[PDB]
Amino acid sequence: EWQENKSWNAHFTEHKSQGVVVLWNENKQQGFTNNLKRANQAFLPASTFKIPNSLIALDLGVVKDEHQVFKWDGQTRDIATWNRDHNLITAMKYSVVPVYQEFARQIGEARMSKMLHAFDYGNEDISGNVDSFWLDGGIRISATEQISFLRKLYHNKLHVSERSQRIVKQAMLTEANGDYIIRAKTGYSTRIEPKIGWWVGWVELDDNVWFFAMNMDMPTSDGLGLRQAITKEVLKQEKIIP
Ligand SMILES: COc1ccccc1-c1cccc(C(=O)O)c1
Ligand SMILES: [Cl-]
């Protein structure tokens, strides 16, 4: 069942923005969103693709574990945190595209395509360059499809090993305190219009889990912090977090 709550639009408009938040109550199997249409519109996944990419790299042995060091290639890039060595944990934390581009090359087109189909991930279309298709190729995924994929990951139901799924969920760890745990991944899509920011993941409570997926218009990098800020305002309004 699905319910549309347009009152959340206030959280976007008060920030002169537009977007969608989708929430899923796992216990009650009920979904909530401010915009049913946009919840089902398909966008480039951008760095949210690091979730499936990590799973595939681990399950194929391209990545041994979360400690393996991927050495900086020595090319100075405009994002300072990328000009350093990384492991899976820090590569996720800092959305280190060049590390995941190498993952994709080693995975290869054939295995990547098969695995995304097994994951039922978005439109499952890797058309484009194997090392950038999630940034400017043909792959697309909606906010509701992100939730479906994330629910499988949470339950270890994706068609990779349990170990691979546990490692990626560890690497998704974003926030934890005495009230909740958030495992999530941000995304920032600029190469194909409309430019958007993503935040997808879930909130673990003592007795329930709330999956979430949001995207919003992102004409400049100035508003990136609104991805988390708007989501949490919705979570607070729905009394999911204090
Ligand atoms: C394509 O990443 C960027 C492009 C332009 C400006 C900043 C970034 C950036 C770099 C790393 C993480 C994030 C982020 O999702 O918060 C954003
Ligand atoms: Cl953990």
Starting at the edge strand found earlier in the chain, the sheet holding 173-176 runs 2-4, 30-33, 19-25, 209-217, 196-204, 181-189, 173-176
For residues 134 and 132, give the distance between their C-alpha atoms in angstroms, rounded to a whole number: 6
Q: Which residues pair with 217 in a beta bridge?
A: 196
User: Residues forming the annotated binding site for a beta-lactam?
Assistant: 47, 50, 95, 227
Pair 158, 120: CB distance under 8 Å: no
98 alpha carbon, closest ligand = 1
CA-closest residue to ligand 1 atom 13 = 95
Q: Cis peptide before 194, with omega less than 30 degrees from 0?
A: yes
Backbone gaps in the chain, preceding residues (C–N over 2.5 A): none
For residues 110 and 118, give the distance between their C-alpha atoms in angstroms, rounded to a whole number: 13
For 96, the 3-state DSSP assignment is coil
In this structure, what are the phi and psi dihedrals at residue 216, rounded to the nearest 5 degrees? -155, 150
What experiment produced this structure? X-ray
Bridging pattern class, strands 173-176 and 181-189: antiparallel
CA-closest residue to ligand 1 atom 6 = 221
Choose among 33, 11, 24, 34: nearest CA to 236: 11
223 alpha carbon, closest ligand = 1
Helices (H), the chain: 9-13, 36-39, 50-59, 88-93, 97-107, 109-118, 133-136, 143-154, 162-171, 226-237
Question: Domain boundaries in the chain?
Answer: 1-242
Pair 42, 141: CB distance under 8 Å: yes
> What is 1-242's CATH superfamily?
DD-peptidase/beta-lactamase superfamily (3.40.710.10)
DSSP state at residue 242: -
For residues 189 and 45, give the distance between their C-alpha atoms in angstroms, rounded to a whole number: 7
Active site (catalytic) residues: 47
CA of 135 to the centre of ligand 1 (A): 13
Q: Relative to the CA of 225, which ligand 1 atom is closest?
A: 16
Token pair, residue 106, equals 């080693």
Bridging pattern class, strands 196-204 and 173-176: unpaired
Pair 21, 212: CB distance under 8 Å: yes
Token pair, residue 59, equals 């399950």
